[PDB]
Structures are given as C-alpha cells and as structure tokens.
A paper describes a structure:
Escherichia coli phage SU10 belongs to the genus Kuravirus from the class Caudoviricetes of phages with short non-contractile tails. Here we show that the virion of SU10 has a prolate head, containing genome and ejection proteins, and a tail, which is formed of portal, adaptor, nozzle, and tail needle proteins and decorated with long and short fibers. In contrast to other short-tailed phages, the tails of Kuraviruses elongate upon cell attachment. After binding to the host, SU10 tail, nozzle proteins, and short fibers re-arrange to form a nozzle that extends the tail.
The capsid is closed on both ends with caps formed by the major capsid proteins organized with local T = 4 quasi-icosahedral symmetry. The closure of the caps is enabled by pentamers, which are bent in contrast to the flatter hexamers. The hexamers in the caps are more bent (H4, H5; 149-150°), whereas those that form the tubular part of the capsid are relatively flat (H1, H2L, H2R, H3; 154–164°). The major difference between the capsid proteins forming hexamers and pentamers is in the structure of the annular loop positioned at the tip of the axial domain. In hexamers, the annular loop protrudes away from the axial domain. In contrast, in subunits forming pentamers the annular loop is bent 90° towards the capsid center. The beta-strands from the loops of major capsid proteins from a pentamer form a beta-barrel with a central pore with a diameter of 8 Å that penetrates through the capsid. The pore may serve for the passage of ions and water molecules from and into the capsid during genome packaging and ejection. The DNA strands from the outermost layer of the genome curve to avoid the beta-barrels protruding from pentamers of capsid proteins.
Residue numbers in the entry:
A (entry chain D): 203 to 302
B (entry chain C): 52 to 349
C (entry chain D): 52 to 151
D (entry chain A): 102 to 151
Write the structure that this text describes.
Amino acid sequence: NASNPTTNIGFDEADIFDMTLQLYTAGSEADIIMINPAHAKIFAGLQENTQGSRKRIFENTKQFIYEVNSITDPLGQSYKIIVNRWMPTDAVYFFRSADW
Amino acid sequence: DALASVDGNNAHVEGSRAEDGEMKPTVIKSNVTQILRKVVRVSDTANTTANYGRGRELMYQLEKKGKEIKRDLEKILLSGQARTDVLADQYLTNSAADPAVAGLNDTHAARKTGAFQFLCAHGGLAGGVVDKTKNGPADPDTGAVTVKVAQNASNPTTNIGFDEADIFDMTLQLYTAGSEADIIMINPAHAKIFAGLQENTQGSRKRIFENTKQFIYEVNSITDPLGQSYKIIVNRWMPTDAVYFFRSADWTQMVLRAPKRTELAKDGSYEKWMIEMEVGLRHRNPYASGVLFTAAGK
Amino acid sequence: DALASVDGNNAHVEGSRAEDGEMKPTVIKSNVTQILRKVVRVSDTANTTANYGRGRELMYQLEKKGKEIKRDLEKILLSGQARTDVLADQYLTNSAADPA
Amino acid sequence: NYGRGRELMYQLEKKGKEIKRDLEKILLSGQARTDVLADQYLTNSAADPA
C-alpha cells in the first residue's frame, strides 16, 4: 500500500501483479479473484492514477461505468473478478475452482 | 561467415593485376553434443508398499526423471554453456582421428555442447561462461553488434534495472546484419518493463478506458521504427539477466540418440534404472540472432 | 510432490558408469472436519385453528435454518480459522496413547 | 552329475533349507524389534527428509 496514504487500512495498487508473477513461476493456472464488496471500488480505481499515465475518457456518453470485472497480467494470464458478500474485508484470494 | 566488403572506391584503369582473387572463403563452425542420464536408484523393499497415489514407485520416479531431464534440456539450451571437448583443432581429422587420445582409453573428458549465448557471436569468456559485461565484436559484412550490454539510461546508473528502450538499438543492429528474426524471449521478471512501455512519466504515453470493464495490462507485440514486427514470449527457464531474439529456422535441435530408458547391471541390493538422451544445438549464422545482457550504466 | 531443481551442469561422459541420483519424497498434509447443527423445535399447539399466512411453521423454520446453515458454511469456508482441535498438535498421533 | 543332479538347483534347494533353519532359529531364540522409527510405526509418516 505504497501509493495511497497511511490512512487506508491496506491494499496495493501495482503489487497485485507481483502475485500473478509468483503464481506463474510456481505453476498455478488459476484465473479468478474473489473480493469483498467493501474493497471493490479500489479495483475500479485501477483504471485511473494520479500520475499522468492512466485516465478515462468519455466522448459525450451518458453512461458512467466505474466498474472492472476482468484483469490481465503482463504474462498473459486473464483474471476474472467475483464479489463475495460472505468474505472478510481484510483478504483477497487468487484461486481456481477445481483446486478447491 | 560473411560476404566480401565493398572496399569503398571501385575505380579502374583498364587492368586488374589481382592476387588470384580476394575470395576469402567461408569459415567452418562446429558444435558438440553432450549426454544427459538422470540416474535413479530405488530399493527393493520400498517397491511393494501401499503407494496410495504414487502407485508403482519405480515408474513414478522414472516419469519424474523424464520431466526433470526435459526441464534440464530446456534450461541448458538457453544457458551459457561453452563448447568443451578434447578436440580443439582436430575436430574432423578423420584420417588421424587425434592420435593423442587412444592409448589410455580412459582420458575421456566431459562433452559440453555450445550454448545459445556462445553461438550468438560472443565477445569473450568470463572464465567458463560467456561474458555478460562486454559487447561482442563487429560483423565484417556491416557494422553490427548482436551482443550488447544494456545501458539503463532511465535510472541514475545505480539501480539494477533493465533498460526500457535499448531494444530498438539491438533491432537496428539485427537489421544491419540481415537477421529477419521476429521473436523475443524474456524472463517473467522483466515483462513489467514491456507493460510499462504503454505508459511513461513525461505524459506522452497513457492508456484509456472508455466505459470498459477491463484493465488489460500486457504487451505481446512490438514494432521497431524500421518496420520489423516482434512477438514477445515468456520463458521461466532463462537467466533473468539475459534476453534472446530467436528465429525458428535459424536454430535446430540435433539428436543422435533419442531419450531411452534402460537398466544397468545387477548383483546388488538395489534395482537400478536410468535414462539416456544425447542432444546438441545448431545455428545457421552467429550474426543472425541477437542477445542482450542486462546491467547498469558505468 | 514437487519436482527437483533443474540442473544446468549435467556433463556426463560416454562409456562410463551410472552413478546414483538424488530423489525426493512426497510431502503430506492433513486437516480436520467441522460439524454444524440446528434446532427447529415446535410446540404443536397450533395447526388446530385456521392458520392465516403460511402454514407448516415447522417446515418454514426448517427451510429457514437450512438456508442459515448454508450461509454459515460459506462464511466459514471463506473466513480464516486455524486447524483448531482438542488434540493440541497431536494430530499426527492418532489413537492418543494418553486416555487422560 | 550322477546324484548332485546339477550345480544350480541342488545348491539352491540346499540354501533354501539352510535359510529355513536359520529363520526358525532366529524366530524361536528371542529378539525385540529394533527398526529406527521412533513411535512412527503407524501414521505412515513418509521418510521425513533430513
């Protein structure tokens, strides 16, 4: 949680890909990410950064979508997202259905 | 090896008076093949237990050794091995066949094949492995250095970070040398740079999301200013401090003996088995493919 | 199980003897189960008059508690709880030698 | 041979009788188990590397 200030409880902004790198070098082939609704707006925040390197653009479109339900790492592994209500706010799981 | 240089001026005064031509014929490159065994030795009392999932202990261990030898081959073919054999200048020497070998019948050395970093126009030998701190020589055909040490001009020459855009210079050298390569292999610990290529700090590169439920952060295709496409590939079996630019036809896997499972002698308290796979690497032209070592500016 | 580290110095010689190699065993893991129960007791003093809304309060509350146990099962599976037992690390000593 | 029959089968059956006698002696003499398992007889407890 380097980018944000020391106020947020905890979560990353560019270290979610270090985990995908670790999984790839281990051998996992999972493409799923379960998250609680509380720590969900953070995922949508990935489409915009304070640094001048990521922004949104609306060409006179009456449809605001601050949502994200799919991620892709530089290695090529897709990653769908799911919002589980009964999960704990202070955790994020990257797993597969068959593994469990 | 190469063609004949241009020599610049080509004036003439109605007469050659040459020296029987300046042909400078081709140079002969050679390579050696090594052996890979991956022995296995199991006891006899440990070959009858329940073995819930492993089942047949020896068969399971043999499959494991097969996977291990395959991984070791995938690693060595991209490693920095150096051609090492008892023959130095008498490689072919069919007639004499190195008279100074036979007589002892036990002076056999360890056959080590030439690796990619060695066959790709090296520029020295750091003891036993190709040097990762000096650029190779120039191609006599045209000015070309297919082996370059990066210069991370984005960091203050203190951080160990692979340069961001030192690949365009390597592509320039490849184009000058006549490579036509179209592939770029990279270790997983460096795709972060290729992904950041889409962005920057000056503000001239930035992604956009017009009402999209996606955060695609990936690169799998590059195009240098010269018009040469390049497909990126990830391989976890390469040295992190190296990048190779392959080409399918330029490299081939030579095989003398296929991977064979067998068993050595007996009259012991053990049931030995083993595998044997003899293989080597070949290259059409050293100056065709390209290599890029990672380091920091001096 | 997990394969062994990939070697990069295999330079075996021709016409030699096969020296024994390195082997690794298969790791083992263990866990424990969990029991969930409910109660839908009823007095039966009802059902003699003309019930108004639902009827079969027993089955209604029973389905309610079924949904409840499903919810709790999901919550438990997704929430972090250690391998708590009364053996107190004696998991690998099945049939404890101390009946105390 | 004439009574020996051969050198392999005769020797093998003789050694079989000998090992049978030795087995009976070792079983009836009296000796406690000494295999190094340290209470891990049950609970298969794979060889535990190191």
